[PDB]
Design a protein around this ligand. Structure first.
Ligand SMILES: Nc1ncnc2c1ncn2[C@@H]1O[C@H](COP(=O)(O)OP(=O)(O)OP(=O)(O)O)[C@@H](O)[C@H]1O
Ligand SMILES: Nc1ncnc2c1ncn2[C@@H]1O[C@H](COP(=O)(O)OP(=O)(O)O)[C@@H](O)[C@H]1O
Ligand SMILES: Nc1ncnc2c1ncn2[C@@H]1O[C@H](COP(=O)(O)OP(=O)(O)O)[C@@H](O)[C@H]1O
Ligand SMILES: [Mg+2]
Ligand SMILES: [Mg+2]
Lengths: 523, 7, 512, 175
């Protein structure tokens, strides 16, 4: 006798009409059969759905600021953008614009910013993980023609929240498979399209559920977003982390949640910050702080096991020397500056998705028949940039003091030492040219100068992309002077002043500005 | 109760 | 009737207004009907669910160390991580953070670690290998069924071969097991057959896998513990201590008639098998034991069968594979590099021939492009240093150079063995013989440096098996020498170098 | 049973005779069944497909060009084309629906233009994103023998609107 729960749920028109009809059918019928399992299944799925249960949101931004500044560190542009969004929701009360998209390398706090937006606004949090989504009927649901039929995860996570307005986190909108039975990008389109959110059609419920109340935010590693989804997203683009930012994330946020997780009280374990810097530099190559959670959690766990099987030491202190006793040998190492001015070697700046690295460039001009060999897993765009740079050297051959027959008389080899690591892009062109000049005059390159820039034939230095990880890489490696092109000078207003105060950044416009600074002797 | 094969 | 049974276990109160609810419904129905069989079945599948009766978990770690070492030989880092998990499990009574995962190739004992951990922690072992009430009758869910069969509140649970669970077909999604793994959704796990929320906290979870090909909602909660391949002394110690007695007991061989020597086992490992684990060794040992039984029934004259390194061609067939040895009998113009792979290590001889010609450069032996780039880099190092090595510098145009590696139809690629090929080029150009007792590894650059390599341990075990006495490693791999067994350190004269001059000083028998 | 919704739908002859043969077949079946669930699903789809419902279209041209000028700026060739359609439409009863292909750079105003044509001609609006459509089952659907069988996604949007003359925005044909 479930007649009072339909009126108790206060459902809309089609929901009440199909449930009243369903109830009567079940009532006429016989219990304990599988068809009564399907019918009774349909009613107790149609009663868990939040048809009218709304959570009150909060409309203050000082408290939202002082919630978002905790649980995270240094995402001030991202948190600024979120406070713009909640600043809009205090006046519009329902956003009809795009959806907040959190893009960044793996390890940055995207899901945790989902939780902190959800705590900051006042709504209930929910996360729909993707990656295993191949079916469109995994988001929209199946119909009830099959014996085992249960709805899609959208209205089921809506059922485990039980609130009309949650905060969905569409996690990993990039990662989904290619062998797809339906088109889930159309369903994920119509959950995000405000003309199609008033009328959402679940295949199990077969009714008209309203999704014009839910706040959606999504996460992303890259932009392999499917085509109908990309114009409904507002990209915030979380960038990578420095070393001192990871030291303050581990200092203020990762250690108190691993001392508490292993129940280490204050008189047991003291991890020195140079050990944290040694895990950053020496053990991990992530852009985020997930691997810092792995080696910090493993480090605290080894401190626990030592405090049980020792019973003599009561205060374990871990400086930068004892990690080799605990976390083993050093796994990786970063490239750093050279000590003396070598002739052919030029340090360049390379940009990867796990952060920025240095990029050593050796050349060798031996007396031969004039054949150039390029080694080091170089892409074709790099090889075109090298022979462009060699064309610059051949055009400026007489004023650089170079014997102009070196195309015919001297074999030239260009090697980049990490031979197994593939690498591509024009952004090392003015490096290569310098190395070639340095091998054709015997003028050594001063080892404290890194450089980046795309070279053209008339000598000018075109702009490059991503100065942030490259200046962090030159900052980490012990480089003192960085030669950037001029039109990347704008990016110098987005760099932390530890780097600017540490480095001596010289913008260049042409190749004579590079050859004047970067070589020891005057050309 | 009777089984029934679906495609 | 059944009331003393439902109060005899003292089930929680919610499940006893449910159980007493179908009991007072059972008072108002016919006994012999099949609906009453569904009712009595639903009573029976709740009085077997372990609502209580925990197993006392053990807190000391020395007896846990030896009771881990009683069934597995050399998984020392894994056993360390398990004792650390039992240390925080000793302090924190309920660890609900991430979940232990054992990633490794098939053959190592990652499944039987569920047994060693199972009687090491003291709890009961339930293994799960992954790869609603109605009139027709229904069994409960698999996750709950293991629990009921075990009948204990704190049973270790294993998710075996999640790499083979998630296929390319419609099967189990990530939902029904990450709702088991997550901490906040385990206080109320309502099983669909019972519709009663049953707790899953204080239940240890171990999941084993052969790669990191794990679904993305699950890889967030799984600590990737790697299990490297066993070395040959470790495989000998696993065969002799743990694997011969289980074949003797599953073949019923009493101890007086069969003797499988140590040279027999090392002959199987070196000559008859190539894998990372010890499974193919057990196919060879089981074949050896059943041939011993057949040779006792078919001949009642002899009774004791002695099996050693010589008579493994009478048994087991003939030698299927072989490994590389040091060519110590002469010192010639070739070098001995080191090669690393998943099965283990291998010696990798490298040959050059430099005849008079036009300067043709031929590279041979199924070489990858990164290796050919390392030959060109090494030859550039020789051309840049032609005068002080004593080479007439016109060899780029007056002598053809051939670089061959002997095992054809074997694909070879990698940045390593650059200084080996530079040593072979300096050797065949100067006429200076490379001393045969020296193996080499490293990566050459144009300035003459030696860059680090990977897999130093298997290269050092390959060089120790091959008969090499002197190994030239890079300087920045001295660190990896902190994890070599000291018999291998004591037998190998390891020289960490950082340039090509330190290489050519040692590796060439005459001074340059 | 359900003939009140069949004669309430005013179906054409083949669709009416087929759905009343299916409903007449359904009554001689025992309920609580699998194939009876299949037949109730098929009747449930054919009772919500539009067979007669038609929206009244706009005859005025000055009000139309006023609308397409209020929500866009200077898409003169397309707005001319829509005035051509609304100029022909005032001379006859029904025309074949025009099949257009707007080709241009991103951000040039092709989707909101479809919203403008929908609001101006009097038609109703629904869009089907063709980006990621990889198989014919999103257009023709599957046979009802199959378990997860639905009538494509054209008929689902025809049923989602509920009219015989909508404006399909077949968006991103080249994707
Ligand atoms: N001529 C115009 N007058 C007024 N608004 C315009 C005009 N052109 C574009 N817009 C505005 O630009 C916005 C985005 O354009 P729209 O999404 O239609 O681009 P699109 O051509 O569909 O892109 P794509 O081809 O990549 O799908 C619309 O909201 C629309 O209001
Ligand atoms: N800026 C930050 N401040 C504090 N903690 C962080 C920050 N970024 C990441 N973390 C921590 O690292 C983890 C990253 O998890 P998550 O954001 O889910 O990874 P991903 O975004 O790659 O899926 C979180 O548990 C979070 O606590
Ligand atoms: N360290 C070891 N000591 C003793 N036996 C081992 C060891 N490592 C592996 N084995 C044997 O090898 C077998 C490997 O099988 P198992 O681990 O169950 O399959 P999988 O490798 O697919 O998980 C085990 O039966 C075990 O007896
Ligand atoms: Mg995430
Ligand atoms: Mg568009």
């Amino acid at each position: 006798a479930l007649k009072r729960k339909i009126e108790a749920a206060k459902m809309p028109k089609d929901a009440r009409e199909k449930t009243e009809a369903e109830l009567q059918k079940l009532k006429m019928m016989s219990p304990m059969s599988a068809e009564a399992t399907v019918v009774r299944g349909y009613i107790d799925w149609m009663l868990q759905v939040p048809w009218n249960s709304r959570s009150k949101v909060k409309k203050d931004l000082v408290k939202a600021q002082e919630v978002l500044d905790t649980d995270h560190y240094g995402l001030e542009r991202v948190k600024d953008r979120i406070l713009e969004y909640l600043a809009v929701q205090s006046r519009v009360s329902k956003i009809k614009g795009p959806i907040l998209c959190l893009v960044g390398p793996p390890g940055v706090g995207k899901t945790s910013l989902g939780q902190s937006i959800a705590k900051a606004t006042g709504r209930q949090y929910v996360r729909m993980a993707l990656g295993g989504v191949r079916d469109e009927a995994e988001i929209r649901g199946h119909r009830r023609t099959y014996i085992g039929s249960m709805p899609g995860k959208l209205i089921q996570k809506m059922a485990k929240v039980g609130v009309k307005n949650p905060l969905f986190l569409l996690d990993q909108i990039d990662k989904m498979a290619s062998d797809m039975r339906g088109d889930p990008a159309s369903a994920l389109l119509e959950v995000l399209d405000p003309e199609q959110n008033v009328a959402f059609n679940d295949h199990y419920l077969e009714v008209d559920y309203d999704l014009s109340d839910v706040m959606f935010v999504a996460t992303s590693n890259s932009m392999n977003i499917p085509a109908p989804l990309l114009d409904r997203m507002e990209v915030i683009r979380l960038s990578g982390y420095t070393e001192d930012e990871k030291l303050n994330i581990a200092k203020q946020h990762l250690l108190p949640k691993q001392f508490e997780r292993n129940a280490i009280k204050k008189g047991e374990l003291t991890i020195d910050d140079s050990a944290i810097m040694s895990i950053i530099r020496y053990y991990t190559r992530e852009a985020g702080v997930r691997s810092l959670e792995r080696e910090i959690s493993k480090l605290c766990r080894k401190a626990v096991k030592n405090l049980l099987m020792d019973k003599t030491v009561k205060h374990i202190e871990i400086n930068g020397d004892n990690l080799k006793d605990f976390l083993g040998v050093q796994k990786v190492d970063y490239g750093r500056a050279d000590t003396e001015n070598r002739v052919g070697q030029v340090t360049g700046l390379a940009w990867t998705e796990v952060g920025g690295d240095l990029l050593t460039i050796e050349t060798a001009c031996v007396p031969g028949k004039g054949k150039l060999t390029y080694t080091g897993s170089l892409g074709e765009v790099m090889q075109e940039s090298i022979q462009a740079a060699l064309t610059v050297v051949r055009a400026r051959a007489d004023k650089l003091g170079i014997n102009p027959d070196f195309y015919e008389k001297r074999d030239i080899h260009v090697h980049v030492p990490e031979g197994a690591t593939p690498k591509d892009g024009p952004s090392a062109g003015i490096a290569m040219c310098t190395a070639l000049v340095s091998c054709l005059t015997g003028n050594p390159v001063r080892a404290d100068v890194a450089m980046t820039g795309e070279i053209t034939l008339r000598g000018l230095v075109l702009p490059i992309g991503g100065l942030k990880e490259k200046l962090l890489a030159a900052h980490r490696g012990g480089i003192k002077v960085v030669l950037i092109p001029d039109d990347n000078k704008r990016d110098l207003e987005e760099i932390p002043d530890n780097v600017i105060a540490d480095l001596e950044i010289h913008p260049v416009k042409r190749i004579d500005d590079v050859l004047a600074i970067a070589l020891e002797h005057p050309a | 109760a009777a089984a029934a094969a679906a495609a």
